[PDB]
Write a protein that binds this ligand. Structure first.
Ligand SMILES: C[C@H](C(=O)N[C@H](C)c1ccccc1)c1ccccc1
Ligand SMILES: [Cl-]
Ligand SMILES: [Cl-]
Length: 318
């Protein structure tokens, strides 16, 4: 079974977590049809989604809301998760105690599933999860942990073999917790392995709606890590997931004619340009950002699930 009982305490003050949450045109305590957007590594909320799911979710009738954990999602993924959990609590109450969808890119999906795994209170407040290129198993493209160059805290934790991904799995987090759709690509140049269309894939969750784009669009279809978020194909799948009565996208809602890898058709010209360039701010943030030679320690609520792994203060013990 999943962790149960009370939510772990936050390491950050509620006022600090509140400061990282924004909604377009409303206060979080009084917002109509919010959607919470959780960004990828090296970016803010606006940097991940200004060119795609902020205008697209508004056009679908949602008020776009987002978190921007500092610095640019490079800090401890466990802290980035505090921003999300607090945001869901606020937006749920602020919209009349109605569940809301969560839509994520890259690390953002790892953050969402970490939050659902270890903070039980939000399970009843997240209507559904729509994750684009989530790296629940991390990525093996960064190399093994013992050969990793100095890297940001969350980059360590997204490396396959990390204590964080170990703990997520052992606490039960590789199974969906709310109705979840995962859209990913075998041609992902950041997160691998993704080629099997099977539980080996880093984006796969048991009992979830697992959509490898090539399984629908064919082997020559090509979308990269950012294109998994921004493409017109991704929009049709995401639209299906957001509207489905089951909380998961449905194969009947999309098909081979939707297999367009370019930025979503409804985006403005300026937006399409920014969507193609989505990654560049992330790389600049990683050059200027924190770097260390070890993986951040697991917080107490997660430590018992990765006994034996090595973090900055040493080997995790029972
Ligand atoms: C931070 C890095 C990343 O997003 N890097 C950006 C996207 C990038 C793009 C092209 C080449 C190098 C890095 C990362 C690390 C582990 C797991 C997932 C992501
Ligand atoms: Cl398990
Ligand atoms: Cl099922």
């Amino acid at each position: 079974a999943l962790p149960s009982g009370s939510d772990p305490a936050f390491s950050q003050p509620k006022s600090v977590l509140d400061a990282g949450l924004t909604c377009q045109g409303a206060s979080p305590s009084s917002v109509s049809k919010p959607i919470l957007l959780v960004p990828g590594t090296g970016t803010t909320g606006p940097q991940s989604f200004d060119s795609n799911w902020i205008p697209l979710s508004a056009q679908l009738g949602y008020t776009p809301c987002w978190i921007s954990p500092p610095p640019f999602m490079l800090n401890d993924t466990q802290v980035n998760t505090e921003y999300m959990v607090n945001a869901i609590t606020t937006l749920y109450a602020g919209s009349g105690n109605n569940k809301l969808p969560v839509l994520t890119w890259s690390q953002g999906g790892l953050v969402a599933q970490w939050g659902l795994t270890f903070f039980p209170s939000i399970r009843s407040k997240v209507d559904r999860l729509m994750a684009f290129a989530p790296d629940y198993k991390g990525t093996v493209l960064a190399g093994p942990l013992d050969a990793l160059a100095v890297s940001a805290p969350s980059v360590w934790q997204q490396t396959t073999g990390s204590a964080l991904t170990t703990a997520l799995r052992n606490a039960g987090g590789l199974t969906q917790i709310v109705p979840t759709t995962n859209l990913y690509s075998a041609t992902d140049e950041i997160c691998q392995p993704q080629v099997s269309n099977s539980p080996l894939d880093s984006s796969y969750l048991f009992n979830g709606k697992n959509v490898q784009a090539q399984a629908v669009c064919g082997p020559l279809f090509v979308i990269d890590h950012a294109g998994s978020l921004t493409s017109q194909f991704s929009y049709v799948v995401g639209r299906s997931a957001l509207r489905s009565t089951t909380g998961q996208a449905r194969s009947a809602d999309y098909g081979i004619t939707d297999c367009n890898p370019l930025p979503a058709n409804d985006l403005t010209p300026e937006q399409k340009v920014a969507a193609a360039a989505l990654l560049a701010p992330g790389v600049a943030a990683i050059v200027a950002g924190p770097k260390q030679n070890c993986e951040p320690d697991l917080m107490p609520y997660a430590r018992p699930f990765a006994v034996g792994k090595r973090t900055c203060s040493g080997i995790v013990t029972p």
